[PDB]
Amino acid sequence: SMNRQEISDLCVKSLEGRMVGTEAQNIENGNAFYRYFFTNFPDLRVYFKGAEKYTADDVKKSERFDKQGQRILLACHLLANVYTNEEVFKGYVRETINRHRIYKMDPALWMAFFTVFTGYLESVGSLNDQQKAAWMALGKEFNAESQTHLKNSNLPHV
Amino acid sequence: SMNRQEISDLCVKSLEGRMVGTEAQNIENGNAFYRYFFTNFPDLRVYFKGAEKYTADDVKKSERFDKQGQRILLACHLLANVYTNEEVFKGYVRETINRHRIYKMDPALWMAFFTVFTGYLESVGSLNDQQKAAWMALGKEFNAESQTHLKNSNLPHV
Ligand code: HEM
Ligand code: HEM
């Protein structure tokens, strides 16, 4: 239904209120993702060494999560902004998977991430039907390349 | 003179013949960057631990440089494809600088990189005047954010 440009446009528009940067608000845009993630998906804290028992307040006051918040937020901005360019998008997916090899994640989490992230964006404001659908379309492609890459890399996959 | 979109368009067009991917040609697109880099800038090999004395043939036959070739090539595709979005672009610059802290690079190299890279693109084909100018404009902005970020981070800078 939607072409790549429209998906990119919708995903980019949905992030205008969650922009990366160096000011207090930008740091909050990233930190709040982890507060949402740790509150609503506490079973996934296990992957974050030393932070397995962190509460939202622990995350709020953690420089580790200020910095990591910016990294994941940046990653999602990159996905949104390069989606139109399918080969670059797929390159970035593979590189993300490579960089997560160390965490030994259940590979079914690659799709689940997009539920966390859209839920977060409902964790601060309006995410209209089209924008959520765009993220789920992007997520579907992210996951398809992730599982292909995992299989090609002799790693566990779904 | 050029707006951000035109710079992005020119930088993206210049990379169509150097696309990331998983086929032999795509791996070559990345490996060849390091063969060019190591041949023409041998004084910079010092940063690559274990590869300080590598020749082009050593790079050609190195899985390390096949993989690293894809990483730098991907990075330059990301710069080109997100340039229009200034805040995302600057976020990616800062993250690149952060990830290079370990190498203790002379900070004047951030600008120099763009000479290596445009020289490489003259290392396989036509880079017209507009496209080279676009890379130098992008490089100027990359460097400006790099030095600002280094200074803000209490790190050596120019
Ligand atoms: C539910 C799925 C995921 C889990 C459980 C997960 C887990 C992790 C963990 C544990 C870290 C290290 C953070 C720390 O210890 O402070 C990390 C880093 C990171 N993750 Fe994820 N991750 C997931 C999905 C993703 C996705 C989909 C992306 C890209 C859109 C991503 C991008 C990053 C980035 C950019 C970093 C910083 C280190 C790096 O550059 O690789 N993650 N992740
Ligand atoms: C002349 C300037 C630069 C030097 C000397 C340099 C040096 C290095 C070195 C030594 C490594 C580790 C590779 C290995 O040991 O196999 C590396 C990794 C990497 N570099 Fe650079 N670098 C430079 C500029 C850049 C720029 C401008 C970018 C982005 C456009 C970049 C992106 C990357 C990426 C993506 C990696 C892979 C690791 C990571 O994700 O951080 N580099 N670089």
Residue numbers in the entry:
A (entry chain A), B (entry chain A): 2 to 159
Reported in the publication:
Ferrous GLB-1 binds O2 with a high affinity and is pentacoordinated in the absence of exogenous heme ligands. The tertiary structure of GLB-1* conforms to the three-over-three α-helical sandwich of the classical globin fold, where the seven/eight helices building up the globin fold are conventionally labelled, A, B..., H, according to their sequential order (topological sites are numbered sequentially within each helix;). The GLB-1* heme distal site resembles that of A. suum Hb, with TyrB10 directly stabilizing the O2 molecule and GlnE7 making a hydrogen bond with the B10 residue. Taken together, the observed functional data suggest for GLB-1 a putative role in vivo related to O2 binding, NO scavenging or O2 storage.
